[PDB]
């Protein structure tokens, strides 16, 4: 839902490498692994366990 | 000059329970809460 | 009942109160077809008319529970709920008006006691000062103006007694 926020916007001929928004969300892999081990809480939206 | 003031030591003998009127709520009130603005942020976040 | 609404809530409120009366289950899509006002003016003068029992609101439960999210509302015009409220809105106003009559005579009691005792006959000078006979003039004027408004109100009240 952020790889299409550049495609349907102008500068069509100006392509983008699609690898500069990876670190926008890569601090959720780190911070979500670290929080769930530290807090002990287990909030899995897909698997439905709490 | 001054009035004879008197007091008796008293004691609760019962509780009575009722709802309040629309006039009992206003009679005990001090302000009419009308805004959702808790704080005015320009005066150092003081209660508005 | 249609002209006490028309005098007080404006003449446009008379128009809806009859248009809802004959159509008798009308909705707001049918109002602005059978009325000729702007739609926010319709949705204002209807809003200042549900506050009194002149109209009810008939909901439809399009979903299972009676949710107001996706539901259209219909507008009845009940006779007796609209009348019994107007019967006692006047009856309260009729009693409020005598409450302020008696409260005014009771706080001016030392005037009226002086107005009965010292000047049983000598009221050409009151045997008093002119700084209060004018004040007595604006008491007994309001004491007769309150019964004027009483008899004016009482003709409106006695209609719904029948």
């Amino acid at each position: 839902l952020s790889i299409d926020k550049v495609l349907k916007k102008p500068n069509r001929a100006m392509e983008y490498d699609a690898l500069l928004s990876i670190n926008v969300h890569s601090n959720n892999i780190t911070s979500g692994l670290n929080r769930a081990i530290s807090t002990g809480n287990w909030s899995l939206k897909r698997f439905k366990m709490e | 000059k001054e009035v004879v003031v008197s007091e008796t030591p008293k004691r609760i003998k019962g509780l009575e329970f009722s709802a309040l009127s629309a006039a009992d709520i206003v009679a005990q009130s001090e302000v009419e809460v009308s805004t959702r603005d808790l704080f005015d942020l320009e005066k150092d976040r003081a209660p508005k | 009942y249609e002209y006490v609404i028309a005098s007080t809530l404006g003449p446009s409120a008379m128009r809806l109160s009859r248009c809802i009366r004959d159509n008798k289950l009308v909705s707001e899509k049918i109002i602005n077809s059978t009325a000729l006002m702007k739609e926010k003016d319709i949705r204002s003068t209807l809003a200042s008319l549900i506050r009194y029992n002149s109209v009810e609101i008939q909901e439809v439960p399009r979903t299972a529970d009676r949710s107001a999210s996706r539901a259209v509302f219909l507008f009845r015009c009940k006779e007796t709920h609209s009348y019994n409220f107007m019967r006692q809105n006047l009856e309260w106003n009729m009693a409020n008006l005598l409450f302020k009559k008696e409260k005014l005579k009771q706080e001016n009691s030392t005037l009226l006691k002086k107005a009965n005792r010292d000047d049983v006959k000598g009221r050409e000078n009151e045997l008093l000062l002119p700084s209060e006979l004018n004040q007595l003039k604006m008491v007994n004027e309001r004491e007769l103006n309150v019964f004027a408004r009483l008899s004016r109100l009482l003709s409106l009240w006695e209609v719904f007694q029948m």
Binding site: - | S18, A19, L20, S21, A22, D24, I25, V26, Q28, S29, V31, V33, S34, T35, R36, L38 | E28, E39, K40, D41, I42, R43, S44, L46, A47, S48, I57, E59, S67, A68, S69, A71, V72, F73
Partner: protein
């Protein structure tokens, strides 16, 4: 037993609502009750301004079912 002037059965409908003292709900961080009172006020403002600017009956009832929902959460919240 309507000898008491607050006896009358229409005193059990929320026309007026007492705002509790700040001793009842302090601020350490707003309180749970303080954030509920403002929400009730905001909904009432939406309703009172909406009744004069002109709002539909479909969203007058949407706010007024929501205002009733908040005061329901104000006392019980279950």
């Amino acid at each position: 037993d309507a000898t008491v002037p607050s006896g009358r059965p229409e005193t059990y409908i929320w026309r007026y609502l007492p705002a509790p003292p700040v001793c009842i709900r302090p601020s350490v961080n707003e309180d749970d009750l303080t954030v509920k009172l403002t929400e009730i006020v905001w909904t009432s403002s939406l309703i009172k301004a909406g009744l004069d600017k002109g709002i539909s009956i479909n969203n007058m009832m949407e706010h007024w079912d929501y205002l009733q929902l908040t005061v329901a959460m104000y006392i019980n919240s279950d």
